[PDB]
């Protein structure tokens, strides 16, 4: 029927639209693992600064988060978040970056609140290798390190990590891309 076949052709396109959508996700899902780390360390490669920062001012995309990375095959699921233009105390002036804890399929056996030592740092692609970064022993009383309720706990860092100025004028921006690094302590935490 020049009308029945019509339904079938559409039932296929519809479903077709779907796979495409899934195949889409999967195309990404890979990338995560591909770039995930199980030793409490991380290297966030943020490509397309100029554009991506610009967006940060126009306020279309204020921040991006990193790939979830952990601290042992079955430890804390965590990741970073950065505000290129800055958040609150450094908006428009600096760049802000924070460490975040996500709901992890194995949080049920891990200690809480999170207590391990972090260590944030923006790598220097120049030859002077003078990377920048600070660290801290997570204060317990804060809602940032409890036992995760939803997707990811509350952010935490230093809105004024580095001055946009100092940044853009140092040897860190290269090929319109840069590397942030996080370092969660894992020694003072026996493993399985």
């Amino acid at each position: 029927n020049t009308g029945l076949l019509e339904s079938q052709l559409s039932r296929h396109d519809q479903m077709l639209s779907v796979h495409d959508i899934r195949l889409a996700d999967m195309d990404l899902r890979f990338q995560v693992l591909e770039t995930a780390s199980y030793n409490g360390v991380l290297i966030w490669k943020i490509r397309d600064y100029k554009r991506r920062k610009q967006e940060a001012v126009m306020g279309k995309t204020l921040s991006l988060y990193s790939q979830p990375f952990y601290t042992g095959y079955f430890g804390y699921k965590m990741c970073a978040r950065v505000y290129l233009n800055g958040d609150g105390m450094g908006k428009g002036t600096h760049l802000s970056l924070f460490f975040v804890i996500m709901r992890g399929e194995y949080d049920a056996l891990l200690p809480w609140p999170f207590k391990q030592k972090v260590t944030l740092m923006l790598m220097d692609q120049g030859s002077s290798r003078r990377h920048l970064g600070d660290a801290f022993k997570p204060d317990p009383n804060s809602s940032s390190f409890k036992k995760p309720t939803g997707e990811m706990n509350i952010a935490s860092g230093c809105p004024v990590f580095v001055a946009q100025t100092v940044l853009e004028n140092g040897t860190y921006i290269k090929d319109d891309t840069i590397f942030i690094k996080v370092i969660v302590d894992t020694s003072d935490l026996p493993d399985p």
């Binding site: 505000y83 958040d87 105390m89 924070f98 801290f136 940032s144 509350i154 952010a155 935490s156 230093c158």
Partner: peptide
Amino acid sequence: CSVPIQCTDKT
């Protein structure tokens, strides 16, 4: 430094 601070997001 220490003294850890947060961001502006909870919508």
